[PDB]
């Protein structure tokens, strides 16, 4: 008559209940219905390709060997302690792109299982996983990161187990704030991707694909508008009189030295990634244009009327570089 | 007789005490009076959006199946080893990221059963809580770090959390955060999560972190303003020595941009406009505009000299008023309004 | 008979001994005398306000229940598996953040029973204790780093800690620290915590970590002082050579700004104003004052050449007095008054 | 009937199955057919010389002591709860620095017994394998970070590891590293330990991590090369004064030094000479040689000016030729010869 | 009969054996011989003074109670889960900071019992030992990083450690630390600690780690020496002529200062003066002295040019000698007398 007496006369002491024989044995595949509930979403490292995320992963399936009889009518949801949580069957999922998952054990175990009157079983657990989504930052200050998280069965083919989403809001998240990125709950489009392995079986899988988008404002008021100002200053270097140039030399060389210092200093705050990004293309094209202004002044000195072509040709190429650059990277 | 044999007679495999059902079952909800007492408050970062607290947590409730009068002991102590044979509320923190107890010499838990059924449970936790902090106005920001205790399985028909009467959150006397100040107005209130399966009890306490502006104001703001003053006194001097004036002037721009580039890698690494990057952009804009107006004066000098003198005087009279209007529209905007 | 069998006869199922009660139950508080032995003292870091130690902890006490007078060997012992079967004093470190035992090749715990009942308990712990460091005078500071042992659930009338007679705290012979050095003047004492229930016993030892300043005095103080001296001799001698004056002064202020800026990744990143930040700000201010006085000379220039030389000699006499009184008022403040 | 009953009939206390005795005892050695499947590959650091891998690990052997023909389930999926009742090969990774299992929602092991005893065992591990990385030529190199699976306590007369024939080491698609790119030729191999006790089987795989150098070619090479070209543009003029000469020498030396400083901040912290420090020191030496050519000009400038122009023509012929000789020697040494 | 049931009669419950009474009880001590095979090495950190090392620790001894005569084969081994049934030598490392076993596929432990009683015990540990590193002469030094085993509770009349006779400690073949290089001549001896209770056995290894100097020579010494030569060039050209010498002087100042600033983020952060710090401060001081003794010439120039020529020639003949005497002092102090 207490809450554990019905469990002890329902399984493991009563008529046989094998906790490793799945429900509907030698029959239809079990349909597990999962829906995660994200708490925190942080530490998206560009040098380890991980991102930590805490989920309230709950999964709800059908167990016909656990139909509650008419011994009590007030309790529709007969609970069970996490002590005997190993005593009844549960689907064996695992995250195929994780690194080190762990449960939470504050003030209690954070697992909770319900058994319903009509045979349904529900499991909620609080996981803190650290997944692995590859960050291909080739468009770094204006890039997107479409990267995902996939739950798969382990040892059960698709004719034994099958994961489906809840189909009404099956993935949620709080009002959170990433340091750099901006998690778009607009595009949260999930989906199945079953893993046909090489001959050995056909294992189920479901996944959620987040679409992170980095915000550009710090880089624009960082190493974009100061660099563009330095390049426009290097253009204004020519406007001093070319006869006996005492100001064209400093107005070129200190702009070039300032841009070289800006590049070699703000190579630090960027993610240490050894392939060519977008910001490096921009900074090196701007440094090359400063050096081209120095070259044009030098061929004016060693040979005049070439500055009249320079002031109308080289910014006319700076605008072409700018439109092709901010048209390919936007 | 011993208190261990008495507790085995009162609850266990002899009496009728069940460790799975809450007290006064099938009735009113039990009210768990909960308070904390923090010890450490550190590791509050801006790249992980978290902080770390190290609390004592004391929670009292009423267990009607522990009333006894056949023993002179008023407060029966209980060892933390055989502690899983008595009901305890399934409290958990709704925003943690990592939480652990301690076993320094013994277990760091304590249970005391009073005579009137009052149960007191004192544990010692270390938590890595999360808090979403924005850095729109970085060196003049305030943060509200929240701590939300709540139930897990029981709804508000079975478990209700309530703070203590006096001093629900106490702080260890003498804390010092690295780059912050922990204020003494901890707004504690209700949370009351409204999920689909009902409403779960949820209490919370909000701290107050006000970052003090000593090091930023003496290391970045005043040097950048000093380089701005050098930019003004560049073209304040007479325009005869044009290479020397343009030399100092340009060098001043190089000094300002080297100051900004060095001050980049000390700030927190977020990707939006902080209130110090607006400053490091506008001061660089002003030193560049000073250089460009001086270069326009030398482009004029090629109204032979009276125009040059009038341009220099108008620039030297218009830049101070413009910079001070920007200083007002910046400091009154960030310091006063978004306090 | 066997030592294990005799120990089972002493404190096993027979003789009626419950290890969940204190010795001298309902009587005087026990006499628990504990000392430590510190091997490592590392990672005193100012970003999370902690420091790590790796200690031996030896605590002895008395119990009249484990008094045996039959076995020949006076110093009995038991392996660290069955430590539950004997009452141990429940201490905990009142300000630690993470504490772990060592279990390499065997558990690193050792219990010993004497003939008089003098029980000796030796643990090897690794601790991350919390120390509230402040760096208001950074390169000349001293820190009082605490370590507090405290009972957990036993009041003053039940358990009392006290250090040993000779050498209660002692450190390994040839240890060292990267930044600080650990002075051999450790202040031991009692800081008894007073709560609402009882007066829980607590003992403490305070270390005086003193920071040495060789690297700072070599690479941040003397180069800045020499840059100020260079800006002094920029105007002490030269009178009217503007291309030998203004570029020199501007490159000097560039060198001082870069020197002050590149040394922010070599400091503990805090927000309140430190001593080294005050020195950097005042040195930058003085080089700016040299540039401003040169610009004032050039403004008053374009007779009054005697007045201009009077300004030059007035500045050349005022800069020594001002920089020397700043130097004195800085070192006397951060070397004598804050002793 | 049920598999939990039939496995207890097959390997339980009733049936004769000594769990810690290898199959075919006092006979031929067991052939363990082993293969891996790497999911992730990252954190290849040059500060601790180890990478972190996350593998599936399947090993499948045979034993006649588990042959059964009772009921037609041709694969007894044994649960990882009673996994300690079946002989499994004590494999260990001979170069790891710490490695763990995965236990999310269920233990991530699998042990399936086939009909003829062809038992299969699939685990999922996360390893931090050590790898001695050679950075003698930093931005243009290959790494041979390997991975060795070898036996513990079992000689080759007891247990023989051997790889799967049909492509054992597979890689998950879309596996990018922040620095390297994993080549598609993972060379298998037969390691073998020859100790003083016996021959211990050791299968191994050797990867290939070619670092890509796009970032270093764009930022650490081309700016400094353009700086050297600017320093050549300095002395390509025929000015026998120096208002441009000292300016461009100053600028080129300053840019070369600050680019070397940023490189020091960005390169890995390795205390022997690499193929980037050689190049930066040579470029700084070339800027030094150009400024000393200017010093020769200004010193020998008062026949005199004729010989000065002749040595200037000689240096203008020499410096591009010496730079081209160095460029050919360096790039052929570090791109084709050592490749 | 079987190797897993014969030990149930050799050391099990139906025989005379207890797992915590040592061999030869109340008599002569046991001579445990230890040897060590180091796989990995590195993470030598100068901020926490530790270094991680991944060893095979094999200790062997011989008792009498583990002897048999009726069994066929020579040496039988047992389950690493049943490792609590045998007395093992209570060993612990005297200066560890945390160590752990390994648990990949199977607990990496092994114990093998011979017929004559020669018990072998081979484990695999992952220690993080601590060695005090004194960076007094940073880029050229040796570090004597040690490793001390020790008994725990058994004095030197019960347990005696002694190293293996033939090759006690042997490091793996392909070992490459990031900074240091481990010398192939490893010292070894006995620590033999004396406490207030008795002699405790202790044996120690000392690895001599010699730091490599190629990176600091190529990137921190040679460019600053080049800057000193450019400082001499700044006043070897024709004196007092034009604003082309103060420019080179203050530019040598600025490049030497950004070198001495950027060369403090790649070094270990210790707060006592090191070798490269002295060598950078003296170079900055020589650059400042060159600029000051050119400012002296520029002052005394305004037959006044004959004195300027005299002091210029005296400085040009003195400053190379003044650098050579300091260079000889520095190198013979940090390379000959201190090894
Ligand atoms: O025999 C194997 C090895 C192989 O390893 C690559 C990873 C895989 C992931 N899922 C989970 C375990 C596995 C599996 C399930 C049931 C029996 C054998 C078995 N496996 C792994 C396998 C694939 C497919 C499947
Ligand atoms: O049905 C649900 C789904 C929902 O998942 C988001 C997480 C929540 C956290 N706590 C712990 C589990 C949960 C709960 C308790 C009892 C029955 C159902 C149930 N849940 C989750 C729920 C919320 C609220 C509650
Ligand atoms: O009632 C309380 C609450 C309070 O919590 C802050 C932490 C403290 C630490 N020790 C351990 C538990 C405690 C204690 C002992 C006995 C009865 C009540 C009780 N406590 C906590 C208390 C303090 C003091 C003491
Ligand atoms: O006698 C030895 C010493 C040697 O130690 C280096 C480590 C090794 C790893 N495996 C595990 C233990 C060992 C081994 C197995 C069985 C008998 C003796 C024995 N060992 C170590 C040995 C090697 C090889 C083997
Ligand atoms: O009583 C003590 C305290 C003292 O602590 C400093 C460290 C020491 C290291 N070994 C390990 C434990 C110890 C020891 C062994 C047996 C009885 C008492 C005892 N100890 C510590 C002791 C020393 C010596 C010894
Ligand atoms: C995804 O594909 C599988 C493949 O059979 C299918 O069974 C399932 O219904 C699909 N939809 C989901 C999981 O929502
Ligand atoms: C607990 O709170 C409820 C609120 O509904 C109140 O009615 C009740 O009196 C309180 N106390 C107990 C002992 O239930
Ligand atoms: C608990 O019970 C006591 C006495 O029965 C009563 O005074 C008190 O209000 C109850 N509730 C709480 C929260 O203590
Ligand atoms: C230990 O100290 C207490 C402190 O009052 C004292 O009363 C007692 O006699 C001491 N000795 C014991 C308990 O043996
Ligand atoms: C324990 O009792 C003995 C017996 O007299 C006494 O000598 C010793 O000082 C006591 N120890 C303490 C800590 O009170
Ligand atoms: C194992 O492999 C070896 C060599 O590949 C072979 O000689 C032997 O027959 C195989 N089988 C057994 C049972 O040893
Ligand atoms: C194991 O033995 C069976 C015996 O028939 C054989 O068919 C199988 O190929 C063997 N497997 C391996 C890997 O040697
Ligand atoms: C250990 O060595 C000592 C040497 O003095 C010897 O007397 C003793 O018998 C040895 N013990 C064993 C068990 O070999
Ligand atoms: C085994 O004991 C004998 C005793 O004479 C001796 O060879 C030695 O002490 C032991 N051998 C070892 C420890 O290898």
């Amino acid at each position: 008559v207490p809450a554990n007496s019905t469990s002890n006369i329902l399984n493991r002491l009563l008529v046989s209940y094998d906790p490793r024989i799945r429900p509907n044995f030698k029959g239809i595949p079990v349909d597990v219905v999962v829906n995660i509930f994200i708490n925190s979403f942080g530490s998206i490292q560009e040098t380890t390709m991980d991102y930590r995320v805490n989920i309230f992963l709950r999964q709800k399936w059908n167990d016909p060997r656990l139909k509650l009889p008419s011994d009590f009518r007030g309790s529709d949801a007969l609970t069970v302690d996490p002590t005997m949580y190993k005593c009844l069957w549960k689907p064996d999922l695992f995250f195929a792109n994780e690194k080190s998952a762990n449960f939470h054990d504050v003030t209690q175990e954070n697992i909770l299982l319900f058994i319903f009157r009509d045979g349904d079983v529900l499991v909620s657990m609080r996981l803190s996983i650290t997944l692995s989504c590859p960050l291909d930052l080739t468009l770094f200050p204006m890039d997107t990161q479409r990267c995902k998280m996939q739950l798969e069965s382990f040892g059960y083919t698709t004719d034994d187990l099958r994961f489906i989403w809840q189909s009404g809001d099956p993935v949620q998240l709080e009002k959170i704030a990433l340091p750099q990125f901006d998690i778009k709950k607009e595009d949260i489009e999930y989906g199945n991707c079953t893993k046909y392995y090489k001959g050995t079986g056909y294992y189920t899988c479901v996944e959620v694909i987040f679409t992170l988008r980095r915000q550009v404002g710090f880089y624009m008021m960082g190493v974009y508008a100061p660099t563009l100002l330095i390049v426009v200053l290097s253009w204004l270097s020519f406007w001093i009189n070319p006869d006996a140039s005492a100001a064209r030399v400093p107005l070129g060389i200190f702009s070039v030295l300032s841009l070289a210092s800006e590049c070699t200093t703000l190579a630090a705050e960027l993610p240490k990634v050894s392939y060519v990004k977008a910001l490096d293309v921009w900074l090196i094209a701007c440094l090359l244009f400063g050096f081209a202004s120095l070259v044009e002044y030098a061929v004016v000195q060693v040979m005049k009327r070439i500055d009249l072509y320079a002031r109308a040709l080289f910014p006319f190429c700076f605008l072409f570089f700018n439109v092709i650059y901010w048209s390919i990277y936007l | 007789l011993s208190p261990s044999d008495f507790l085995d007679k009162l609850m266990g495999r002899t009496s009728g005490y069940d460790a799975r059902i809450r007290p006064n079952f099938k009735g009113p909800p039990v009210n768990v009076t909960c308070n904390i007492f923090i010890n450490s408050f550190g590791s509050v970062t801006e790249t992980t959006m978290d902080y770390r607290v190290n609390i004592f947590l004391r929670q009292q409730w009423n267990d009607s199946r522990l009333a006894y009068s056949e023993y002179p002991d008023d407060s029966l102590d209980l060892d933390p080893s055989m502690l899983d044979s008595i009901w305890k509320p399934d409290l958990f923190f709704a925003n943690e990221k990592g939480a652990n107890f301690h076993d320094v010499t013994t277990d760091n838990k304590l249970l005391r059963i009073s005579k009137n059924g009052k149960v007191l449970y004192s544990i010692r936790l270390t938590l890595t809580l999360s808090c979403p902090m924005d850095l729109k106005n970085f060196p003049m920001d305030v943060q509200t770090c929240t701590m939300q205790l709540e139930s897990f399985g029981y709804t508000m028909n079975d478990l209700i959390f309530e703070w203590l009467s006096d001093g629900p959150v106490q702080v260890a006397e003498g804390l010092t955060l690295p780059q912050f100040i922990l204020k003494e107005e901890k707004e504690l209130g209700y949370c009351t999560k409204h999920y689909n399966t009902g409403k779960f009890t949820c209490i919370e306490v909000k701290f107050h972190l006000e970052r003090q502006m000593g090091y930023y104001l003496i290391q970045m703001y005043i040097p950048s303003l000093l380089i701005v003053i050098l930019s003004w006194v560049s073209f304040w001097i007479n325009m005869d020595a044009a290479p020397a004036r343009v030399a100092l002037g340009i060098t001043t721009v190089l000094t300002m941009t080297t100051q900004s580039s060095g001050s980049r890698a000390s700030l927190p690494k977020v990707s939006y406009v902080k209130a110090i990057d607006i400053w490091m952009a506008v001061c660089l804009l002003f030193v560049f505009a000073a250089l460009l107006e001086y270069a326009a004066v030398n482009f004029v000098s090629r109204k032979f000299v009276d125009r040059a003198k009038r341009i220099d005087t108008i620039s030297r009279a218009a830049f101070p008023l413009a910079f001070l209007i920007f200083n007002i529209f910046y400091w009154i905007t960030y310091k006063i309004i978004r306090h």
Side-chain angles (χ1 to χ4, degrees), chain A residues 1-12 16-72 74-242 244-250 252-302 310-312 314-315 318-319 321-330, chain B residues 1-4 6-7 9-19 21-161 163-172 174-291 293-301 308 317-339:
Chain A
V1 280
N4 80 298
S5 62
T6 318
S7 278
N8 274 17
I9 73 173
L10 186 59
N11 49 32
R12 215 211 53 196
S16 278
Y17 178 85
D18 211 55
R20 295 294 94 191
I21 294 187
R22 67 191 187 84
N24 312 326
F25 193 49
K26 315 183 311 302
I28 72 160
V30 195
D31 271 326
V32 185
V33 172
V34 307
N35 60 284
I36 75 165
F37 182 89
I38 294 140
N39 282 119
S40 87
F41 193 104
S43 177
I44 312 181
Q45 302 183 55
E46 285 105 7
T47 178
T48 319
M49 312 279 169
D50 49 50
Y51 66 104
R52 296 189 35 87
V53 54
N54 300 56
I55 57 182
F56 270 115
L57 161 73
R58 67 160 273 259
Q59 49 185 351
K60 166 184 174 58
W61 69 99
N62 210 313
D63 215 352
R65 317 158 310 186
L66 294 180
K67 312 204 72 169
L68 300 192
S70 84
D71 300 65
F72 50 92
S75 315
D76 198 305
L78 164 69
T79 183
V80 67
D81 290 331
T83 299
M84 36 184 75
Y85 183 73
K86 69 186 191 295
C87 274
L88 59 98
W89 188 83
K90 40 178 196 309
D92 42 359
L93 69 86
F94 83 108
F95 298 88
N97 62 338
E98 75 173 12
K99 283 172 179 289
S100 88
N102 50 324
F103 300 90
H104 285 303
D105 185 27
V106 65
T107 324
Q108 209 66 257
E109 269 277 271
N110 278 13
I111 319 177
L112 165 68
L113 196 154
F114 277 168
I115 312 183
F116 285 159
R117 169 93 43 84
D118 42 354
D120 263 7
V121 180
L122 180 137
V123 173
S124 278
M125 32 174 51
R126 184 159 152 83
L127 274 65
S128 175
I129 59 188
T130 173
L131 303 160
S132 88
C133 73
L135 305 173
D136 182 307
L137 68 192
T138 185
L139 318 173
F140 162 69
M142 288 157 287
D143 71 328
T144 184
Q145 301 304 316
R146 195 167 189 76
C147 81
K148 58 190 185 178
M149 154 181 45
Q150 55 188 357
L151 311 97
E152 311 216 345
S153 177
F154 198 91
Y156 281 156
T157 56
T158 319
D159 48 13
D160 290 28
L161 204 76
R162 189 163 324 203
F163 290 90
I164 56 161
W165 293 103
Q166 211 202 319
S167 55
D169 218 17
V171 52
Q172 297 170 353
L173 72 160
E174 313 312 309
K175 294 186 285 185
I176 57 175
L178 270 301
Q180 310 201 44
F181 294 90
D182 211 344
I183 168 67
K184 284 300 169 59
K185 53 190 306 180
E186 314 184 50
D187 289 329
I188 203 82
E189 214 67 70
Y190 36 80
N192 44 359
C193 59
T194 171
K195 263 202 180 176
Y196 166 67
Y197 272 97
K198 267 76 203 166
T200 83
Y202 198 79
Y203 301 98
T204 173
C205 173
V206 284
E207 82 179 359
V208 194
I209 313 169
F210 307 97
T211 315
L212 299 167
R213 264 179 278 242
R214 182 180 268 112
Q215 41 195 351
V216 198
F218 163 63
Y219 301 105
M220 290 189 287
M221 315 306 176
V223 289
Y224 272 136
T227 293
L228 210 168
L229 257 57
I230 288 302
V231 173
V232 168
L233 197 147
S234 178
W235 298 133
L236 281 192
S237 174
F238 278 154
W239 266 25
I240 309 286
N241 55 83
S245 65
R248 280 156 94 88
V249 161
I253 65 184
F254 295 112
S255 72
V256 155
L257 182 150
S258 155
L259 211 61
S261 158
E262 199 75 28
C263 164
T264 187
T265 297
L266 268 298
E269 294 216 304
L270 304 189
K272 283 175 303 309
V273 160
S274 315
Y275 47 75
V276 52
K277 319 197 300 294
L279 202 46
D280 275 315
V281 168
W282 161 262
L283 275 170
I284 290 317
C286 277
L287 189 64
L288 172 145
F289 277 169
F291 168 71
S293 177
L294 267 296
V295 158
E296 200 88 340
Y297 161 73
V299 292
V300 165
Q301 176 179 227
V302 79
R311 266 83 56 87
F314 273 90
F318 185 68
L319 261 295
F321 151 73
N322 254 321
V323 60
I324 195 68
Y325 174 81
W326 271 351
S327 159
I328 188 63
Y329 286 161
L330 265 167
Chain B
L1 73 158
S2 315
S4 67
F6 178 51
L7 274 180
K9 186 252 291 185
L10 176 59
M11 36 89 74
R13 214 58 80 80
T14 297
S15 182
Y17 192 87
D18 211 354
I21 47 180
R22 57 157 180 94
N24 51 60
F25 191 46
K26 296 299 178 175
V30 54
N31 312 312
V32 171
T33 297
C34 181
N35 68 328
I36 72 164
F37 170 79
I38 77 171
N39 283 11
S40 157
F41 202 108
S43 316
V44 296
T45 76
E46 288 106 5
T47 186
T48 323
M49 301 321 199
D50 58 351
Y51 67 99
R52 159 171 277 98
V53 78
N54 177 269
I55 72 182
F56 284 92
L57 192 147
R58 183 256 302 262
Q59 53 188 355
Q60 317 162 359
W61 63 94
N62 271 337
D63 193 14
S64 316
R65 282 177 319 277
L66 302 184
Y68 66 101
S69 315
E70 283 90 307
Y71 209 104
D73 271 356
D74 202 0
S75 45
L76 287 165
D77 205 328
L78 200 143
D79 63 57
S81 64
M82 210 60 45
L83 179 136
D84 214 286
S85 57
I86 188 170
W87 188 76
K88 297 166 305 148
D90 42 353
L91 183 146
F92 90 105
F93 291 78
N95 50 359
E96 70 187 4
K97 292 154 86 75
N100 45 3
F101 314 97
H102 303 124
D103 50 354
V104 196
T105 295
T106 64
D107 269 327
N108 268 17
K109 326 185 194 72
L110 178 63
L111 193 77
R112 278 196 179 276
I113 301 173
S114 279
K115 204 156 211 152
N116 53 278
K118 186 166 179 60
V119 177
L120 186 135
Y121 187 39
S122 177
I123 55 174
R124 176 175 216 264
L125 306 153
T126 290
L127 316 159
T128 297
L129 304 165
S130 90
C131 75
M133 42 174 61
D134 53 3
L135 300 179
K136 293 171 66 71
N137 40 1
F138 159 68
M140 282 91 72
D141 60 337
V142 291
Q143 327 282 2
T144 53
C145 306
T146 322
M147 196 185 95
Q148 310 173 27
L149 310 95
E150 70 178 2
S151 161
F152 202 96
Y154 312 124
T155 69
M156 281 191 97
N157 309 330
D158 302 330
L159 199 70
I160 289 182
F161 285 122
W163 288 104
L164 198 39
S165 87
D166 61 49
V169 186
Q170 300 173 1
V171 184
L175 282 179
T176 293
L177 275 84
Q179 196 189 83
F180 276 117
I181 279 186
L182 178 84
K183 274 178 66 180
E184 215 57 46
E185 180 59 35
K186 295 168 285 285
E187 307 164 0
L188 54 92
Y190 283 175
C191 165
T192 320
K193 293 244 188 172
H194 278 283
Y195 281 106
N196 183 273
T197 81
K199 40 158 189 160
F200 294 84
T201 177
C202 192
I203 59 185
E204 69 174 12
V205 54
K206 315 193 211 58
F207 299 104
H208 265 65
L209 300 198
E210 301 203 306
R211 178 188 325 250
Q212 54 188 355
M213 63 203 171
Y215 161 70
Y216 298 115
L217 194 142
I218 205 165
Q219 190 84 333
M220 308 190 178
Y221 279 156
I222 292 316
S224 310
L225 196 141
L226 211 54
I227 304 306
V228 159
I229 297 312
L230 267 69
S231 88
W232 286 347
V233 77
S234 316
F235 81 107
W236 182 246
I237 80 171
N238 192 236
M239 66 301 295
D240 299 343
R245 184 157 149 175
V246 78
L248 151 89
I250 284 207
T251 317
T252 319
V253 173
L254 157 66
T255 309
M256 167 61 197
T257 192
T258 298
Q259 167 69 50
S260 178
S261 67
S263 175
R264 284 286 158 85
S266 162
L267 308 162
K269 266 71 63 181
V270 299
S271 298
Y272 37 90
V273 277
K274 301 147 293 160
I276 206 177
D277 263 345
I278 277 177
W279 183 273
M280 295 324 165
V282 170
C283 293
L284 180 48
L285 201 82
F286 272 16
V287 75
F288 151 77
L291 200 173
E293 293 317 300
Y294 162 67
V297 159
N298 312 116
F299 182 51
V300 161
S301 177
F319 272 170
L321 58 87
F323 177 76
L324 266 300
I325 288 170
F326 160 72
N327 218 35
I328 295 313
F329 278 157
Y330 175 83
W331 288 120
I332 306 310
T333 306
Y334 275 137
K335 184 52 195 49
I336 308 301
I337 306 168
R338 322 179 188 176
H339 37 274

